[PDB]
């Protein structure tokens, strides 16, 4: 039941998706970084709002704080600082439909995106053909590889278990005479089957802790505070007690310029992705004993 069809090679990744190719993720994340810090007021809320309409999201609330702009939509949360635009959303949100419009918004403002990521945390496995997970991920890959031909996708963890599929474009200029530095801190704590809200808490300018809780229930924590890097063990423990989930997924960023056991939790998988650009993305999945 298999013959050889002489077929053309798709010219673009979009031809491959349509020609040769419900959603079971838990959360999608889209981040952009810049070559030079951006003025916080340069990018209006109206412009960011209209860019998320392309992915079917209507702005509902937004607060302005020191070095931060927070936009709350129905199913997504958007933080905007001088260093990064980070938007996290539920899986019913086709966040890849906002990748290109977001990039155009940057270009109109002469803002150069030199680093970007698209991440989705999966409870399930894409190869489950009773689910649309795969087709969504093929579309995601189309918008990303179309926008970042130099970008690449990676899959951290077992494909059949809790894992992260993320795509990373790295266009950072590292000439010795360059002033672009990478001391970024990123810590993500995903908690499955906790025992609904979107929140941002800011303790310092340009630094935040976002918490998302939504439907199987789960809660999604993220922070970029330099203080958090010092005591990761303290903050995760405090998170597991308030929530008490069945399984946990940690992602720890060790940046270029700069988690062995959890209480009542056995390790399922752990590993790191050292990128050529010197930074590392550490991951570990745990399950309750």
């Amino acid at each position: 039941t298999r013959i050889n069809q002489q077929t053309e090679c798709p010219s673009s990744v979009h031809d491959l998706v349509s020609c040769w190719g419900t959603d079971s993720g838990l959360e999608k994340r889209f981040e952009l970084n810049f070559a030079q810090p951006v003025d916080i007021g340069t990018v209006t809320v109206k412009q960011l709002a209209s860019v998320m309409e392309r992915a079917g999201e209507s702005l509902r609330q937004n607060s302005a704080e020191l070095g931060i702009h927070t936009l709350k939509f129905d199913r997504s949360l958007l933080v905007f600082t001088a260093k990064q635009i980070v938007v996290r959303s539920s899986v019913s949100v086709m966040l890849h439909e906002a990748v290109h419009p977001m990039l155009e918004l940057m270009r109109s403002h002469n803002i150069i995106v030199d680093w970007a990521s698209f991440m989705r945390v999966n409870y399930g496995s894409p190869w489950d053909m009773t689910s649309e997970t795969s087709d969504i991920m093929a579309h995601e890959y189309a918008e990303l590889k179309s926008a970042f031909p130099t970008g690449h996708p990676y899959l951290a963890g077992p494909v059949d278990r809790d894992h992260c599929f993320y795509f990373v474009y790295d266009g950072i200029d590292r000439d010795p005479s360059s002033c672009r530095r990478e001391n970024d801190v990123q810590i993500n704590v995903y908690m499955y089957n906790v025992q609904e809200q979107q929140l941002l808490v800011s303790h310092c300018a340009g630094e935040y802790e976002t918490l998302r809780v939504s439907t199987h229930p789960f809660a999604s924590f993220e922070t970029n505070a330099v203080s958090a890097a010092s005591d990761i063990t303290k903050i995760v423990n405090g998170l597991l007690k308030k929530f008490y989930p069945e399984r946990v997924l940690l992602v720890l960023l060790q940046d270029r310029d700069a988690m062995d056991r959890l209480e009542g939790f056995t390790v399922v998988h752990r590993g790191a992705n050292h990128f050529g650009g010197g930074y590392v993305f550490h991951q570990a999945t745990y399950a309750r004993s």
Binding site: K145, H152, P153, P158, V159, R270, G271, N273, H274, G276
Partner: protein, 271 residues
């Protein structure tokens, strides 16, 4: 390809379109006759250069996973490295009831863009088993340096091109496979030697081929020589220092099962 049967395991290596998994039911029978029991099964393949030509359960990694799952349901699949660039696919199943001691080693290399002055010697208009003609090829290319006289070896020069060689010394093995077509150059090396540091072993292979890019993957066991070395901050021979003319592009570290680790690194030559 290569088959390595040992007192306690089987290692079957194949290239091309050969459907390697069809022999699993037979390997299980082979283990049952001797009254053994399967406790560890690993299927692994570097990302295919021409995935559209792979047949049977190998046309897609979802097929390889479905197939391997039909036989070993507990197993787990992994993908190390960039999925649209150099990467490895692993399916790993283990039924270790009795804790044991793991002192094994596995070193694998995959190389592309082989030295054009070398591809000349892997051509021949006739099939040649191990013979003086092949000895001319091992000296002429530098393989004699990788496989010294202290190894029992048998090699095969293909027609019109292609070179395979196997070597065994005690309980250690060594395998080289070469595709020399200029447009799709490729060479592979795998050994299970105990070594506190693979740098010399690896560079020995690189001098033979000097490829534009190559991937090295190391499987570290907890009770092996290099296992103790790695787990104590010591170098193991894959660090970028040992390859000045190469720039490390992406590296991966994974404890794919409790106590056992795998390291993969992708290198690319500089300008």
């Amino acid at each position: 390809x290569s088959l390595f049967v040992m007192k306690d395991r089987v290692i079957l290596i194949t290239c091309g379109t050969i459907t390697l998994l069809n022999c699993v039911p037979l390997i299980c029978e082979a283990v049952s006759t001797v009254c053994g029991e399967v406790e560890w099964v690993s299927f692994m393949h570097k990302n295919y250069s021409f995935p559209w030509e792979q047949k049977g359960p190998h046309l897609s990694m979802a097929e390889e996973f479905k197939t391997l799952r039909s036989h070993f349901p507990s197993g787990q699949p992994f993908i190390f490295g960039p999925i649209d660039s150099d990467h490895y696919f692993l399916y790993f199943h283990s039924d270790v009831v009795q804790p044991s001691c793991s002192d094994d080693a596995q070193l694998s290399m995959t190389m592309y863009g082989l030295d054009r002055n070398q591809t000349k010697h892997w051509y021949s208009d006739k099939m040649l088993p191990t013979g003086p003609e092949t000895a001319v090829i091992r000296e002429a290319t530098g393989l004699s340096e990788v496989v010294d006289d202290s190894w029992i070896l048998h090699d095969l020069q293909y027609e019109p091109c292609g070179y395979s060689i196997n070597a065994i010394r005690g309980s250690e093995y060594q395998t080289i496979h070469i595709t020399p077509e200029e447009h799709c150059s490729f060479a592979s090396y795998e050994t299970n030697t105990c070594a506190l540091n693979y740098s010399k072993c690896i560079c020995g292979v690189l001098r033979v081929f000097d490829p534009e890019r190559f991937s090295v993957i190391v499987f570290i066991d907890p009770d092996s020589a290099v296992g103790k070395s790695y787990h104590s901050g010591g170098t193991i021979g894959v660090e970028p220092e040992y390859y000045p003319n190469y720039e490390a592009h992406h590296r991966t570290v994974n404890e794919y099962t409790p106590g056992h680790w795998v390291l993969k690194v992708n290198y690319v030559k500089r300008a």
